[PDB]
Subunit: 116 residues, 3 copies
């Protein structure tokens, strides 16, 4: 199993959620966050004075899936979140050693849906 953690533009998140649901990926956890990237370098210019580069709102999506679904989900998120401009976001792939379903106590192979 892996955790896929994606940071995307708020404007694009509804198309990422729809793209995932259309292929049966329903379980997801979402957080409002702020971020910056390289754009702006060390500082910015506010008519006279020096200003820091602003942390701006973004949406964090976390989706935990079986190893055999990781590449499919990365593609769905990349093709729905893309616009072409700096600030489109990044995806991190993090190992998960086990998952427990609270309602049933199922774990391991029984804790996540099989797509294949």
């Amino acid at each position: 199993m892996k955790k896929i953690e994606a940071i995307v533009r708020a404007e694009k998140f509804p198309e990422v959620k729809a793209a995932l649901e259309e292929r049966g990926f329903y379980g997801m956890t979402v957080t409002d966050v702020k971020g910056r990237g390289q754009q702006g370098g060390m500082q910015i210019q506010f008519r006279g004075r020096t200003m820091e580069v602003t942390l701006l709102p973004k949406v964090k999506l976390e989706i935990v899936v079986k190893d055999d679904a990781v590449e499919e989900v990365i593609g769905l998120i990349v093709n729905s979140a893309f616009t072409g401009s700096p600030g489109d976001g990044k995806i991190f792939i993090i190992p998960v050693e086990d998952v427990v379903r609270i309602r049933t106590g199922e774990r391991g192979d029984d804790s996540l849906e099989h797509h294949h």
Copy 2:
């Protein structure tokens, strides 16, 4: 050491927090999040008016502990967060390679 990341109902979170504190598990970080699960499928019903399945509020708990404590913490969370209905949540066990205490610069299970 391991990071235990649990997504629970906001109504159950106080009972999970007390069950952990009773057994000396005091350090924890908590975030307000939203989520959906399998319940609802693709869309739901509001009158020949499809609507999307809503992302609803949940509480995310993160607690980092020694390897030997992981199963005890998982059972304390499951027993206090359970209701039996869809939406009860999930627990993810994630490896941590080290931990640093900012106040002293101490590392290892020591720093926990």
Copy 3:
């Protein structure tokens, strides 16, 4: 590559952000969170009854960096977030198997920062 997840005081966060930027570490994701530590033990009081220990606001910083940069970034955070009182926070180092840049599809140390 590794994910460095640091929980720090809100008052110290602007000094942490400036210390990383000064050394060219620009990419970072920040979340408002709440937390408690050991301080307070099982409970407190009172006027004049017992109460739970309060989960209080903190700032979570996540920065993903190359393996060879981890010890430098740990030093930058410890020195800028330190005050010397209980509640200064903790840094967790979590393995990352890969990173994907959405704009280009590029992966690896390459996709950083």
